[PDB]
């Protein structure tokens, strides 16, 4: 097998001391580093400068575009050399994929699900608003903050698979006839399965699948390994069945996203009202313990 892209102990740009590898999936590796300028721990993403698919150029572009917005890591630095490309950003805390897996039956309560859901929808509207599609919405791309002031905030952690979908003016770009999907089968919309150009609604489909998995603990295509077979299931599936364990207003959510296509801007305010109305109906308040606190 290959060694780690970076040796633990090295200094990147005479500033970022590599301490430990913390992740390895996607199209590179991520490390906890010490920033010797600010004297703080940071996250350091790296990719080989020779590997066939490099995505950190996209990571930097989107992270920069989103500075000042909610639910995103603070940008700290970036660079390219003959060995590796790197991006430095705020280090966060516990990953939603991990937090869900730690639950008794892999489920969150509707209180935790609704609050996380609404934060995630905020993060999706935000990336759409600067002209990018995420295209890889899944639990492991979100984490809670790691300080008292940030640990009730959910952050969108990665943008590697994003695509710019607009002009500078906000004109939706003509879709390609074929678009080869590189995201996760489990949370992918039918359009990803069909190798169609993904749109804003495909990120909302993936959120819908994440919310259902949070409350039910599994999706109907949990045990199916073949990507096509998953696609077939989704193509025929009656998504109304997934409403059973969601608050009633999610019928509005599902009817709305079902109506959308590549060329149709989502009604984000309608989808936000589904969360806001559900949270009031269930008497949920922001200070209530999340499931991992209690
Ligand atoms: C499928 O379930 C999984 C997969 C991978 C995984 O590991 C990690 C580890 C780190 C990160 N990312 C980050 N972490 C902390 N601070 C961060 N700032 C920016 C990215 C980042 C994401 C998943 C955890 C759960």
Swiss-Prot record:
> At the top level of its lineage, which domain of life is listed?
Eukaryota
Q: Provide the protein's localization.
A: Cell projection, Cilium; Cytoplasm, Cytoskeleton, Cilium basal body; Cytoplasm, Cytoskeleton, Microtubule organizing center, Centrosome, Centriole; Cytoplasm, Cytosol
Q: The Protein kinase domain covers which part of the protein?
A: 16-279
Q: List the disulfide bonds.
A: none
List the catalytic residues.
136
The effect of residue 138 to E/A is: Leads to inactivation/destabilization of the protein
Effect after changing residue 45 to E/A: Leads to inactivation/destabilization of the protein
Residues annotated as binding ATP: 22-30, 45
Disease field reads:
Spinocerebellar ataxia 11: Spinocerebellar ataxia is a clinically and genetically heterogeneous group of cerebellar disorders. Patients show progressive incoordination of gait and often poor coordination of hands, speech and eye movements, due to degeneration of the cerebellum with variable involvement of the brainstem and spinal cord. SCA11 is an autosomal dominant cerebellar ataxia (ADCA). It is a relatively benign, late-onset, slowly progressive neurologic disorder.
Its quaternary organisation is:
Interacts with CEP164. Interacts with MCRS1; the interaction is required for recruitment of TTBK2 to the mother centriole.
- Family to which the UniProt record says this protein belongs: Belongs to the protein kinase superfamily. CK1 Ser/Thr protein kinase family.
Its annotated function is as follows: Serine/threonine kinase that acts as a key regulator of ciliogenesis: controls the initiation of ciliogenesis by binding to the distal end of the basal body and promoting the removal of CCP110, which caps the mother centriole, leading to the recruitment of IFT proteins, which build the ciliary axoneme. Has some substrate preference for proteins that are already phosphorylated on a Tyr residue at the +2 position relative to the phosphorylation site. Able to phosphorylate tau on serines in vitro.
- The protein depicted here goes by the name Tau-tubulin kinase 2
Primary gene name: TTBK2
Instruction: Give from-to of the shown chain within the full protein.
Output: 6 to 299 of 1244
């Amino acid at each position: 097998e290959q060694p780690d892209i970076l040796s633990v102990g090295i200094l990147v740009k005479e500033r970022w001391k590599v301490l430990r590898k913390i992740g390895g999936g996607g199209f590179g590796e991520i490390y906890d580093a010490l920033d010797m300028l600010t004297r703080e721990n940071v996250a350091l993403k790296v990719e080989s400068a020779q590997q066939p698919k490099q995505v950190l150029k996209m990571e930097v572009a989107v992270l920069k575009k989103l500075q000042g917005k909610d639910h995103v890591c603070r940008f700290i630095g970036c660079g390219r050399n003959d060995r590796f490309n790197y991006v430095v950003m705020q280090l966060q805390g516990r990953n939603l994929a991990d937090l869900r897996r730690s639950q008794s039956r892999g489920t969150f309560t509707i209180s935790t699900t609704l609050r996380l859901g609404r934060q995630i929808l905020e993060s999706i509207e935000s990336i759409h608003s600067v002209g990018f599609l995420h295209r890889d919405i899944k639990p492991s791309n979100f984490a809670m903050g790691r300080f008292p002031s940030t640990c009730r905030k959910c952050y969108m952690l990665d943008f590697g698979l994003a695509r710019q979908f607009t002009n500078s003016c906000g004109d939706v770009r003509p879709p390609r006839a074929v678009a080869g999907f590189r995201g996760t089968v489990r949370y992918a919309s039918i359009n990803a399965h069909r190798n169609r150009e993904m749109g804003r609604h495909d990120d909302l489909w993936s959120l819908f699948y994440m919310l259902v998995e949070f409350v039910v603990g599994q999706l109907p295509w949990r045990k199916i390994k073949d990507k096509e077979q998953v696609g077939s299931i989704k193509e025929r599936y009656d998504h109304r069945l997934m409403l059973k364990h969601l608050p009633p207003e999610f019928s509005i959510f599902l009817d709305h996203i079902s109506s959308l296509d590549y060329f149709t801007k989502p009604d984000y305010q309608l989808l936000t009202s589904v969360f806001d109305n559900s949270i009031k109906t269930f008497g949920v308040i922001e200070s209530d313990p999340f499931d991992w606190e209690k």
